Design a protein around this ligand. Sequence first.
Ligand SMILES: O=P(O)(O)OC[C@H]1O[C@H](O)[C@H](O)[C@@H]1O
Ligand SMILES: O=P(O)(O)OC[C@H]1O[C@H](O)[C@H](O)[C@@H]1O
Lengths: 312, 310, 309, 312, 312, 312
Amino acid sequence: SPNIKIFSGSSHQDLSQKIADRLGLELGKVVTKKFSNQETCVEIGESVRGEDVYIVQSGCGEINDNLMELLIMINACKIASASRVTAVIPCFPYARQDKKDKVGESRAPISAKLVANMLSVAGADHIITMDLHASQIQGFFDIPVDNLYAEPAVLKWIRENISEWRNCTIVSPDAGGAKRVTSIADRLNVDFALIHKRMVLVGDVKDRVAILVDDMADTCGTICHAADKLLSAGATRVYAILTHGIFSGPAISRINNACFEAVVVTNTIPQEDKMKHCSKIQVIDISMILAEAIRRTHNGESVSYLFSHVPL
Amino acid sequence: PNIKIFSGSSHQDLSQKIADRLGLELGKVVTKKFSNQETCVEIGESVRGEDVYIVQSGCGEINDNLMELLIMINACKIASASRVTAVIPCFPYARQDKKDKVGESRAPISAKLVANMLSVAGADHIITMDLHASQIQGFFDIPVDNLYAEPAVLKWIRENISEWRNCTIVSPDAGGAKRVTSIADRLNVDFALIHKMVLVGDVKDRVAILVDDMADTCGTICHAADKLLSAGATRVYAILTHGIFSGPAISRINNACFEAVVVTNTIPQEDKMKHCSKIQVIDISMILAEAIRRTHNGESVSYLFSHVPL
Amino acid sequence: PNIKIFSGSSHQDLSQKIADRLGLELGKVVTKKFSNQETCVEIGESVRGEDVYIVQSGCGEINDNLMELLIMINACKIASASRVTAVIPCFPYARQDKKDKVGESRAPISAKLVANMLSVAGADHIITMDLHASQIQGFFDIPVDNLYAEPAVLKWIRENISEWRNCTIVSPDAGGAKRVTSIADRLNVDFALIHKMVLVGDVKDRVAILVDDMADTCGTICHAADKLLSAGATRVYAILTHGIFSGPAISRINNACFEAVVVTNTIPQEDKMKHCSKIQVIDISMILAEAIRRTHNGESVSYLFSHVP
Amino acid sequence: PNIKIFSGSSHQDLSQKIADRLGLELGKVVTKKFSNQETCVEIGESVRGEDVYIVQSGCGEINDNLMELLIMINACKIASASRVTAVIPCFPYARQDKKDKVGESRAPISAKLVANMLSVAGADHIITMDLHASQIQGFFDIPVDNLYAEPAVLKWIRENISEWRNCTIVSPDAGGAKRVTSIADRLNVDFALIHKERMVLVGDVKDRVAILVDDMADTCGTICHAADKLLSAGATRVYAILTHGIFSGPAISRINNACFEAVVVTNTIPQEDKMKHCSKIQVIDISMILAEAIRRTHNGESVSYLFSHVPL
Amino acid sequence: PNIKIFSGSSHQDLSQKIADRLGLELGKVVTKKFSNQETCVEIGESVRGEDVYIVQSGCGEINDNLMELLIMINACKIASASRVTAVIPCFPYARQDKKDKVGESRAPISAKLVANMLSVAGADHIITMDLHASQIQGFFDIPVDNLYAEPAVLKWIRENISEWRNCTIVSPDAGGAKRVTSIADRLNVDFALIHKERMVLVGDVKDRVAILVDDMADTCGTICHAADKLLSAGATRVYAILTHGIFSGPAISRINNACFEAVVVTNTIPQEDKMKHCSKIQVIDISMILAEAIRRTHNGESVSYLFSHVPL
Amino acid sequence: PNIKIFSGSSHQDLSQKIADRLGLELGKVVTKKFSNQETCVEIGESVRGEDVYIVQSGCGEINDNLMELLIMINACKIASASRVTAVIPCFPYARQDKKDKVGESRAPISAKLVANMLSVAGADHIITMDLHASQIQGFFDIPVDNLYAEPAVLKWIRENISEWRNCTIVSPDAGGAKRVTSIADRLNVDFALIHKERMVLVGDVKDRVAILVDDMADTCGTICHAADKLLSAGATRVYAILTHGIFSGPAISRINNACFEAVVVTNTIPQEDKMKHCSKIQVIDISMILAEAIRRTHNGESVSYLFSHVPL
Ligand SMILES: O=P(O)(O)OC[C@H]1O[C@H](O)[C@H](O)[C@@H]1O
Ligand SMILES: O=P(O)(O)OC[C@H]1O[C@H](O)[C@H](O)[C@@H]1O
């Protein structure tokens, strides 16, 4: 039916607008502030009674304030008798678990499940997200989660922006990133190689373009060395492509000092501020991927809508 | 023999005071934030089978402290702690804002959300002090102890206000009526109430004590104190259990006519006392320590919290 | 086009008034007790796929009416109703009668229990009026509408108390301060409040209106009215949303000095108005009917309940 | 070593009887009603860390007693009781008069709702006797103990009816067949069954003592008509033995005008007042059976405490 | 206009018969087992926003079928179906193999477990036929329909047993009393009962056709011994009518050797294979009852619908 | 002093080995299937107030075993067991067969379903070994211990492969990269990776012993093609060490035909039968890891038991 409303957090508003543009809608009116004493203030500026509500709130920026803002907004819509509340969380907070593997066993994803449980008790009915650090986070909920992939937009950018892409190779910065890399190399019909930590390279990278692909970049320590090792192995030029560009701490300083031809991230986190101080950052717009998932969750057009059919 | 106390980053000083009163050292925990702002918690010691009490207040950067508390509770619960208790001296998000919607009331969304998050994190029990509304106790299905600072406030009044026997308990707004009427009856004294500004009750030529549950920006308590000065009150005091003091509060109090502003230690005050000569704190760590004692139930089924002399 | 209203045994006059305001007949239901005291409920019509509103107040034998309500809600939910809303004008069990225990405070056991039973029975939504404490709204996870009689009380004051422009709004105890301060601000009048008995404020030679959310045994409101007479108030009124009037209340009011005791229809008053002449009732069916109209959402997304008179 | 027993207003002679047998005095509780008929409960002593048993029957003013029970259970849980067990000798709402909408069956709601209330109040364990249908045990997620009166009835038969070795056991309706056949097999006697629709008897009753056995007697229309039919078939004398003696409405008048030698019930429901107006009612005491189930629930003496070994 | 019927692997003919009666084709679904015995289910079409009914019986390899049912129910729920109904003609685990115990009764552990798994998988509604005990309805919090085969059995008796007006409806054991008295009352005929303790008969069967009626037949030892006893007591011809024909173990061998004129079952479990080795089996098709219940649950036609009125 | 280890039918060798290591006999339990395929469970001794551990693996007919585990857990829970732990060496349904959609991922319905059933049956704690994905730990709210066979594998390598100091740890696919580099880092040896698309190997294994390491082997098609590829690359001898030996379908025929010097599995699944038809299977006993985890869960020894410190 005709009852969709999009709201934005303070997390990232440019994207919230881009999605609404792609769907032909204006953003719902909402007051999101902080009181003097640090308490999150939310005021929904319009009736959501009977509406299909989508709240866009990345999990970047001051993460706990943004998370609290998201939970209050979701819960407020649910008690104002909204028909459905979907959290559109492009970058899911707390996905990563640096450990100290209790070598006899493994640690559990406390914080990712906590975040999931809070979304559930707040009253979220459905989650739309992008490239969960681990896809199993999908099973931390009982509500449907759509874990969308940036690979098609990356794959695109690669063919259109790297000339010798036909002859290149994709490298993984770490051990765990193999699947992703192998997926992209298989889709492109190119070679793959992987780096592991002193740091070692497995695979042929000599005299061909190397593309480091990973899910996110926070501190950037790892991709930077990886770029050094790829240069030492005789790669012509090195690129870095990450879906989530967190870039905290010394990250910006590291990339400018590193040998990257370009660092490509999607728009799931705001980059406008970071591009001002870093020339090698380029962004892939993923507003259509998200807009298309909201359009399909809404189910207003055809039941047999297939997500996979819409062009990019 | 299985009691463990842990502190968050919110308020270490009380956490130490409580552990002292119980003859315990604080459990080892690394509580920080990563580069990307995510709260990091690591329990540095075993809690398997232990009765764990986490002390965290809701002052400071409240959302970082709250998230840290939830991760600690949950982490303790999946580490097979026998019981996890959240000790939250000042409960965050308890005060509803609203424009007093007419025709109907707003709901305590954020206060219920905090309760819901504490429950799913795995809190088995909450110990707190002077909830903004006592009904917040009923937002949980686990037991909540809503402790009162009143006995310590009562003792402080008798010990520090020479003329306390002939004074008058003033409420800063219409809402705090039951608290001030409660204290005046306990002291066998008069009460008055202020509402925006008008004063109801006689306060001229007697010591006036403003009582409220908490003071944030302090605009209401300072205008009320002004009205009490213009109405001929000898000296005006402000007694609040929770001293948040955000924004211009310190500047407003120093410019205002208070003889003293008394708060408890439920929120850290050392920093604010360096910038305010008139803040005094009532230590309430024993009340909290005695409630923790009582939840643990290590001595007898029949220990009564009220039998312990302050 | 799927609304249905049903009545409990508790108050059927209001249930009819509400149904009238919505152009509806009450749904067919048999509500009795068996020989052995067990509540019998039989939904006499189909509720499959419908937006069901059960109107039941908590008065009379609260426990029989409450159990009856819970069985009706659950039966409708298991009969595959689209939505079941409990319309509870006077919420049972809200007042706390804790002997105080100063160290700390007792918890709303019975009020939380009632909320939990309504939820587990299968209530999707609560409509109620002037909850003893508005925080009871948060004892649920489903939406609760806590409606106010204040607008109807304001209107009644302006139309029936000639001197309302001057006057003064008195609270019977410390707890009702915020409620009386609310009405006085809406009316641009003075307030005072009574405690223990002591009076704080200025009754003078002005009309004093005692305002509180409910009157049970009426010991407090009648002593407050006496104190208001000793302070020289021209005439004393009592205005309460919930007129329970149990025990000696009716007898106490007749002996008291009230010019009138005004209550709303959230609880049935016909029997008690026969034994008390001072009781007048404010009809609130339009507030409840408008919350039901708004819950159903048949008109539009933006129907604002505050725009209707 | 921490067991506390509280009685409700439901039945106190029984709760005292249980307490005598365990060696305990009943815990202090104020259990009354306010002027507005709201139920008032106050726990007169600490239950912190205690294993609490609340005895409340499903008789009397059922909704008052039920609400009272729920408030006490909830109150003990929020006072940090270790465990709260509801001892409900006669489970309210078990029987459901309906009229199976030919083609289907009605569902048990009031018995399931009653179970759900016990659960949401905070009950950890139920002890009950002779549930109208044993499946009510599955209406809970907490353990339910459905004790049987059969052993006390078998004793009573062997010690109070002389010709018991050649007596017939008769079901007053079709639904009670299993219960009566079980007693006939234990006694090594014959049974017969009555069905109304005008009454029909299958089975031989001529010149033998007939014992009508059912789980409950309410209005007693059915057992009285069965008594007439049994005399019509030549039975020497007729007894009726029910577990729950509710006896509402015209029950006492019906039994005083019927041809019963005796009506035997348990004290799951108080009988002193009804016995004053009906010389035929006799009660068999079931306190020990309940006391023994509470002892086992508590688990004081041993892990391998077998409820089936204790003498009666 | 959003209704899909899907079939399990358990009984497809009924799934087809039901889909036919509603004018529908079965939804596309791949239901297999992997090499390693894990149940594989993959939904071949969109169910987003659709009213889904999964028909799976509790016949066959009960645990494999139960897992298949649970995975497709859950799969539909995470694919954002509006509602998912489990149509379970023969409810698994509904019969308790108690030793009854003395003193107390065991609990319906397995039947409640099945109920809890159906609920947690995401079932919104259950349609079933002749639950072994009607109380299983209360093991759920979602609606459950227990539908009866009695009207179809009543039709079959009148249409196929000519001397039906002077027959006897016999229960093979205690407990099946209410079922046989219900049918005897509908036909205005006599009833009798069999009990094992040596088998005993109460009621008259001499010179009249005896119809043994029960809810289900597993190993068939009781019904066959009962058939001998009905013959030795001088019944003209003996029939057996059961709603659920499981016929496991020696059942077929017992029936072929027994004196039954016919054993009549419904189609809730597939019989074609068993009819190939047993000639006395006749089947009553009940697809119209289940389909009509699916129609009424869907609520396509009218709120005032009531399936008591549909012909059969 | 409350430990009871009970065994399922799925693998009792381990159940005995675990109980032996703890100085205990297995609890008495009857675990069978009825004629009609329904799972029968009867607890042969009291568990009231006891700490119960039920050992069942996801091997064999997985759905029958899972149903048996769930019924035992429930039976113990309704018998007022103090705590019930599921010890599930090989977690069923943990592997995803999605054939990933290109824009988003599939949810883990089955695994979570299994998790949800364990939870709703009443499991208080899960002990498992080398979960296919460690995130399954977060599918529960009860604690899950995901134990590693790595230390035991590390022992076996040093003890049985003499040139182990110069060997390579090879991953059969992209997913196991992180698993093999962890082992190579522990041994201070080289790693390599195999990938399909024709099969590629990145890294170097020539003239060195190659050890294929993976979490489980089902049908064994990948590890056997990988072993052939390792032979084409000049590996001295090829080993396979997987935690979980399912070996269904052609696995045994494939392994016997393959060039493996040895295929090493742990005892999480019974191997005696498969070893009779395959001479290259060797088993690592991991019974001490599970027993020590049960010891630590019981908490009978101290608060500091450190799983880390006990030697295997
Ligand atoms: O008065 P009637 O119901 O006809 O017969 C009385 C029965 O009603 C109740 O169900 C009890 O079982 C009584 O035996
Ligand atoms: O079944 P295939 O596709 O032939 O082989 C893939 C793998 O399936 C299991 O992990 C086996 O260990 C195999 O190596």
